[PDB]
Amino acid sequence: SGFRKMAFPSGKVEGCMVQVTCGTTTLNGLWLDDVVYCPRHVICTSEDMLNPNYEDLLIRKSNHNFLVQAGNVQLRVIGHSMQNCVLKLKVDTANPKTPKYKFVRIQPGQTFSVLACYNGSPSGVYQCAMRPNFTIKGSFLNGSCGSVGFNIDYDCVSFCYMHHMELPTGVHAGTDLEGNFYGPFVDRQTAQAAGTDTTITVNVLAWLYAAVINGDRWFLNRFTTTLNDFNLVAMKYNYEPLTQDHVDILGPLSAQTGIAVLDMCASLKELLQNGMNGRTILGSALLEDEFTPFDVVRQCSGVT
Amino acid sequence: SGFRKMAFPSGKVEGCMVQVTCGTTTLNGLWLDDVVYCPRHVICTSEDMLNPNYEDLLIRKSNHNFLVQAGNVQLRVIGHSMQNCVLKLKVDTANPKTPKYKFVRIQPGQTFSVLACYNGSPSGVYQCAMRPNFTIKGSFLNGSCGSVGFNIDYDCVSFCYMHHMELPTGVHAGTDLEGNFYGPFVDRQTAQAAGTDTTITVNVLAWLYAAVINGDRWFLNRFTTTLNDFNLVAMKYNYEPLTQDHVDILGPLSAQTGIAVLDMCASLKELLQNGMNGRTILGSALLEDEFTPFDVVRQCSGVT
Ligand SMILES: O=C(Cc1cc(Cl)ccn1)Nc1cncc2ccccc12
Numbered sequence: 001s002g003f004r005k006m007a008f009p010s011g012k013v014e015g016c017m018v019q020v021t022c023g024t025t026t027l028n029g030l031w032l033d034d035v036v037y038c039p040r041h042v043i044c045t046s047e048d049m050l051n052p053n054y055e056d057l058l059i060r061k062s063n064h065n066f067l068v069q070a071g072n073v074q075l076r077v078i079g080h081s082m083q084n085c086v087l088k089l090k091v092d093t094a095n096p097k098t099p100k101y102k103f104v105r106i107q108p109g110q111t112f113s114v115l116a117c118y119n120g121s122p123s124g125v126y127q128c129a130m131r132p133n134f135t136i137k138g139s140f141l142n143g144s145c146g147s148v149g150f151n152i153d154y155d156c157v158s159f160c161y162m163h164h165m166e167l168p169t170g171v172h173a174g175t176d177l178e179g180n181f182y183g184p185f186v187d188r189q190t191a192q193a194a195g196t197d198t199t200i201t202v203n204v205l206a207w208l209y210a211a212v213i214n215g216d217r218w219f220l221n222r223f224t225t226t227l228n229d230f231n232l233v234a235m236k237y238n239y240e241p242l243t244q245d246h247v248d249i250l251g252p253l254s255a256q257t258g259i260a261v262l263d264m265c266a267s268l269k270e271l272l273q274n275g276m277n278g279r280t281i282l283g284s285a286l287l288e289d290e291f292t293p294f295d296v297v298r299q300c301s302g303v304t
Numbered sequence: 305s306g307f308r309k310m311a312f313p314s315g316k317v318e319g320c321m322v323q324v325t326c327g328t329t330t331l332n333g334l335w336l337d338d339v340v341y342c343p344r345h346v347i348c349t350s351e352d353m354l355n356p357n358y359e360d361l362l363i364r365k366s367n368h369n370f371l372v373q374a375g376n377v378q379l380r381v382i383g384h385s386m387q388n389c390v391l392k393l394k395v396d397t398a399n400p401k402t403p404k405y406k407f408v409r410i411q412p413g414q415t416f417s418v419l420a421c422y423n424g425s426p427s428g429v430y431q432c433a434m435r436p437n438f439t440i441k442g443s444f445l446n447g448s449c450g451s452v453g454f455n456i457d458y459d460c461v462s463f464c465y466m467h468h469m470e471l472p473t474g475v476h477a478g479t480d481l482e483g484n485f486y487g488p489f490v491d492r493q494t495a496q497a498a499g500t501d502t503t504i505t506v507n508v509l510a511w512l513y514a515a516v517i518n519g520d521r522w523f524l525n526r527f528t529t530t531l532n533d534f535n536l537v538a539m540k541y542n543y544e545p546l547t548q549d550h551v552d553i554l555g556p557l558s559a560q561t562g563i564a565v566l567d568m569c570a571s572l573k574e575l576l577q578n579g580m581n582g583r584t585i586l587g588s589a590l591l592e593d594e595f596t597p598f599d600v601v602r603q604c605s606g607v608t
C-alpha cells in the first residue's frame with residue numbers, strides 16, 4: 001500500500017548521458033549505438049538565440065567543433081546532421097551501455113520519467129505528465145537541455161522527450177527524439193503562447209481508483225452520472241471531456257474495485273463542485289492528474 | 305525553474321540488487337563487495353511471522369539454503385550471519401558493479417530515495433522523508449522487502465534504509481543497513497504503535513523558500529515572529545518546534561531570497577492559521593515537508 005509519484009529506475013538512461021560542447025555552449029547528449037543526439041541550439045551563442053538561422057550556424061561547424069565527453073573519455077565525431085531541432089553526431093564508438101530502446105512520440109496526457117542532467121552528469125529523476133497543451137511542468141535549470149524523458153517496458157527504454165527550453169512562464173518545452181517539438185514551440189528566445197491547458201480527466205479518475213485501492217474512500221458517494229452530464233461538469237472546470245475510449249482504459253481499475261466508471265465520475269463531479277472540504281486523498285489536497293490508468297495498475301501490482 | 309519531488313538517479317543502486325530465496329520466501333537483497341544484505345524474515349514461513357524465534361529459525365538453515373540470484377546468474381554463498389534484523393550472506397564473488405558506498409543511520413526529518421524492487425528487479429524510484437515517528441510513507445507491495453533507501457553525494461551512495469514491513473496502518477518500517485529498526489518496531493506480524501507523528505517544520509520552511517525562488521510568492525506577508533511565538537503556533541498545529549539549529553540550516557536559503565528566517569516563519573504561521581484559501585504553492589494545496597533545506601538548494605542549484 002501507499003501511492004507515490006514514482007519514476008522508472010534511471011540506470012539504463014544514465015549510461016547513455018554524455019556532455020556536448022560546441023564553441024562556448026555545453027549541454028547534454030544522448031549516446032545510443034554510434035550516434036549522440038542533442039538539441040541543435042548547442043551551436044548558438046547568446047546573440048544567436050533571439051532568432052537563429054540554424055542552417056547557417058551549422059554550416060560554420062565541423063565534426064571537430066563538437067566536443068563529446070562520456071564521463072572522462074572523449075568521443076571521436078565522424079559526422080553531424082541536423083534533423084528538425086536535434087543534432088545527430090555520429091561517433092566512431094558504439095555506446096557499450098546502449099540499452100534496448102525505441103524512439104516514441106507520446107500523446108498529451110501520458111506520463112514519463114525525466115532524468116535531469118547537467119554537463120552530461122545525472123542529477124535527479126522525476127515523473128511527470130505531458131500536459132494537454134504539450135508543455136511539461138518540469139524542474140530544470142540552465143544546462144539541463146538535452147536531458148531526456150522516457151518510459152521502460154521490461155528491458156526496453158522508449159525515449160519520448162528531449163528537453164530544449166524553458167518558456168518565460170517557467171514551464172518546459174521540448175521535442176521527440178527526431179527533433180520535432182511537442183506543441184507550437186520553436187527553439188528561439190521569444191515569448192511563445194502555450195495555449196489553454198486542461199486537467200487530464202482519465203488520469204484523475206485513475207488516481208481516484210488508486211485512492212480506493214489504498215484505503216482513501218471518503219469521496220465515494222451514492223450517486224452515478226452519464227458521460228454527457230459529467231462532460232458538462234468537465235467543461236465548467238476545465239477538464240478534458242471523457243470519451244468511451246477513456247472509459248475502456250479505466251476498465252481494469254473498475255473491475256479491481258468493483259466501482260463502475262460512471263459511478264467514479266459522479267464522485268469526481270462532486271469533488272469538482274464541492275472541493276475537498278479540507279480533506280486529503282493520497283496525501284494531496286488537490287485532484288492529481290499525473291498518473292495514467294496504466295501507471296496506477298503498474299504501481300498497485302508491482303511490475304519490474 | 306519548477307520544483308519536483310526529485311529522487312537521486314538509481315543506476316548505482318540498481319547494480320546492487322539481487323533476489324534472495326530461502327525455503328518458500330523470496331525477497332530482495334543488496335550485494336555490495338562480497339556480501340548480500342537482506343531482511344532476516346526471508347527465513348520465515350507465514351506460520352513463523354506471528355512471533356518468530358529468528359535464532360532458532362536460522363539454525364535450521366545452511367549456506368546452500370540461501371539462493372541468491374543477480375539477474376540470471378547464481379551467487380555461491382559461503383557464509384551467513386545475522387546482525388540485528390538483517391542477514392549478511394557472504395558470497396564468493398565481489399559485485400563488479402559495487403559503487404563507492406557508506407552505511408548511514410539517517411535522522412528523522414531527513415529525506416532519501418527509495419528504489420522499489422520485486423524479485424531482485426527494480427520497479428521504480430521515489431523520494432520520501434523519514435517521518436519524525438520513524439515510519440516512512442512509501443509505496444510498497446508484498447515482495448518489496450529488502451528494497452533500499454539511499455542518498456548520493458557525487459560518486460558515493462550512502463545507504464540509509466532497508467525495507468522490512470508494512471504496518472496494519474499502511475505505513476512502512478525498516479532498518480538501517482546494520483539491521484537496527486528505525487523506531488520502536490519489531491519484525492513480527494503484530495499491530496505496533498507508531499506513535500504521534502509531526503510535520504517537519506524546517507522542511508516546510510525550506511519548501512516555502514523554494515516557492516519564493518520559483519516565483520510563488522502570494523503567501524509572503526508584512527509580518528515577522530519570534531521563535532517563541534512561532535513555536536506556540538507549531539505546538540497547536542502539530543509541527544516540530546523550530547530551534548536555532550534549524551534557523552542556521554535555513555541560512556543559505558534566507559541569504560538567497562533575502563527573506564529572514566523569522567519573516568518566513570510569520571508567513572508559515574499565517575498559512576497554518578488561515579489555510580491556503582483555495583490557492584496552491586508549487587502545485588500543492590498543502591504544506592509540503594518532504595524537502596530538506598539541502599534538497600531545495602541542490603534542486604535549485606543543479607548538483608550532479
Ligand atoms: O531555455 C533554455 C535556453 C534556450 C533554449 C532555447 Cl531552444 C530557446 C531559448 N533559450 N535553457 C533552459 C532550459 N530549462 C531550464 C532553464 C532554466 C533557467 C535558464 C535556462 C533554462
Ligand SMILES: O=C(Cc1cc(Cl)ccn1)Nc1cncc2ccccc12
Pocket residue numbers: 001345353444445446447448449468469470471490491492493494
Ligand atoms: O510486511 C511485510 C511482510 C512482513 C514482514 C515483517 Cl518484518 C513483519 C510482518 N510481515 N511485507 C510487505 C512490505 N511492504 C509492503 C507490503 C504490502 C502488502 C503486503 C506485504 C507487504
